[PDB]
């Protein structure tokens, strides 16, 4: 026969991983919501925890 590519055994190959990124762009910013006050901060930091003020 031949040297015959049909005989000699063919390897396979690989390369490292690559991170995919799912895309639906999330912005809807900037808008409401924004602009933290000091008051909702008075909700934010302890002490005197929730529930919410008035």
């Amino acid at each position: 026969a031949y040297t015959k590519i049909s005989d000699v055994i063919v390897p396979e190959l690989f390369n490292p991983y690559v991170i995919n990124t799912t895309t639906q762009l999330s912005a809807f910013f900037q808008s409401g919501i924004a602009a933290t006050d000091d008051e909702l901060n008075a909700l934010a930091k302890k002490a005197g925890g929730g529930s919410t003020l008035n």
Binding site: Y2, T3, V8
Partner: protein
């Protein structure tokens, strides 16, 4: 894992007015296994201090 198996010919003579014809080589393939094992065992405590050694 692959390999190239060795060759066996004979000879011819050579000469005047005679020629030579080539010959071919083959290949073959092997494989193996990966295994995994393990175990674990705990101890106790109060007995460890009351016992005199760990």
């Amino acid at each position: 894992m692959p390999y190239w198996n060795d060759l066996d010919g004979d000879s011819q003579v050579l000469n005047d007015t005679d020629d030579l014809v080539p010959q071919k080589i083959n290949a073959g393939q092997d494989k193996a296994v990966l295994i995994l094992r393990g175990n674990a065992w705990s101890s106790h405590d109060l007995a460890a201090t009351l016992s005199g050694s760990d």
